[PDB]
Structure formats: structure tokens, C-alpha cells
Amino acid sequence: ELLKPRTLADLIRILHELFAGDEVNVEEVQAVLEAYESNPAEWALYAKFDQYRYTRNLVDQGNGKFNLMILCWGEGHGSSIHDHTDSHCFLKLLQGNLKETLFDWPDKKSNEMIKKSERTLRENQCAYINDSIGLHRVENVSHTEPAVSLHLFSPPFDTCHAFDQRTGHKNKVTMTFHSKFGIRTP
Ligand SMILES: [Fe+3]
Known part of the structure; x- marks a missing residue:
């Protein structure tokens, strides 16, 4: 029984229920994420920005089933084109807008990665991706x-690949946390 999360804490409690088992009902998880109405006071603790690039701020470790993190994107900050390491990725906007650009997996042949589509993700909207769907880039194009x-990854992963848009070549990247549970983690 899916109920509207009243607060971020309530959302987290609900997510623990939805990930209690070994599989993931993607449509239910996405629906509850989209039903949480972003309340900045509830997540201010995690919203730690860096001047030069986007930051990853761990909120909850999902009892081992998922990582829930808040990403903070300064003006003009964006990601690589990347995969999600055989995990589910849910992405909910808490503030502002992000451009999501979709790409297919590259062939072995070195070639320009041509975007398959793009969209603007707006406040409170929740997007979903996995490796079976493709790759994406996420950018705050605002000036x-x-x-x-708010990102939910299940299972948790700490590495992924970045893809060179010019060639399709990939490189392994290890993700780092800017903070965990509100505590800056150099
Ligand atoms: Fe992603």
C-alpha cells in the first residue's frame, strides 16, 4: 500500500519497506519519490555545494539495499555520460531543473556518441534509468x-564508467562523497 510520503524522513521509512525484499518495483518506487513534495528545510543538511563541480551527499544507506544521496549542482555543473553499474537509478528533482541527455551504449568501433534524446527534468519530477535502457548525462544548464x-541507486555502487562523447570509449570512475549523513567527508 503506497502512501504519500509526508516528509523526507517518511519517504526514507517508506523506501526501506519497498526495498525490504530482493527485487524492486520500479513503478512503485518512482511513484512514491514523485509523491514526496520537496521541502528544502528537510534536506538543507545534505545540500552542501562545491564551487567547481557537483557534489554527492549521502543521506541513507538503505540497510544495504540502496544508496540515497543528494546531488548539488552549481550553475553550469554537470556529469559525464555514464552508466549505472547494473543498478537501478532513480533521480528526483528537489530544486531547480536538470537537463538529461540519453545515449545508447556505444559499439566497439570508435565513433561520436550521438544523443538519442534529451529532456528537462523539473522540480519534483522523478526520472528512472538503468543500463538496459542506456546511458545518460545530467547537467544543470542554468546560469x-x-x-x-535526490538519487536512489539499488544495489549501491561506488564505481561506474564515464564515456567519451567523441569516441564511445569508457573509463572507470570511483565516485566520492562530499558528505555523509550531514558530515563533510574530505
Ligand atoms: Fe546517472
Whole structure:
């Protein structure tokens, strides 16, 4: 029985129920994420920005089933084109807008990665991706508004691949946390 999360804490409690088992009902998880109405006071603790690039701020470890993190995107900050390491990725906007650009997996042949589509993800909207769907890039293209997003990865992963848009070549990247549970983690 899916109920509207009243607060971020309530959302987290609900997520623990939805990930209690070994599989993932993607549509239910996405629906509850989209039903949480972003309340900045509830997530201010995690919203730690860096001047030069986007930051990853761990919120909850999902009893081992998922990582829930808040990403803070300064103006013009964006990601690589990347995969999600055989995990589910849910991305909910908490503040601002993000451009999501979709790419297919490259062939072995070195070639330009041509975008398959793009969309603007707006406040409170929740997107979903996995490796079976493809790759994406996420960017805050705003010149005037920082963006904040809530990401759920299941299972948790700490590495992924970045893809060179010019060639399709991939490189392994280890993700780092800017903070965990509100505590800056150099
Ligand atoms: Fe992603």
C-alpha cells in the first residue's frame, strides 16, 4: 500500500519497506519519490555545494539495499555520460531543473556518441534509468539557479564508467562523497 510520503524522513521509512525484499518495483518506487513534495528545510543538511563541480551527499544507506544521496549542482555543473553499474537509478528533482541527455551504449568501433534524446527534468519530477535502457548525462544548464536532486541507486555502487562523447570509449570512475549523513567527508 503506497502512501504519500509526508516528509523526507517518511519517504526514507517508506523506501526501506519497498526495498525490504530482493527485487524492486520500479513503478512503485518512482511513484512514491514523485509523491514526496520537496521541502528544502528537510534536506538543507545534505545540500552542501562545491564551487567547481557537483557534489554527492549521502543521506541513507538503505540497510544495504540502496544508496540515497543528494546531488548539488552549481550553475553550469554537470556529469559525464555514464552508466549505472547494473543498478537501478532513480533521480528526483528537489530544486531547480536538470537537463538529461540519453545515449545508447556505444559499439566497439570508435565513433561520436550521438544523443538519442534529451529532456528537462523539473522540480519534483522523478526520472528512472538503468543500463538496459542506456546511458545518460545530467547537467544543470542554468546560469542563475543551483539545482538539487535526490538519487536512489539499488544495489549501491561506488564505481561506474564515464564515456567519451567523441569516441564511445569508457573509463572507470570511483565516485566520492562530499558528505555523509550531514558530515563533510574530505
Ligand atoms: Fe546517472
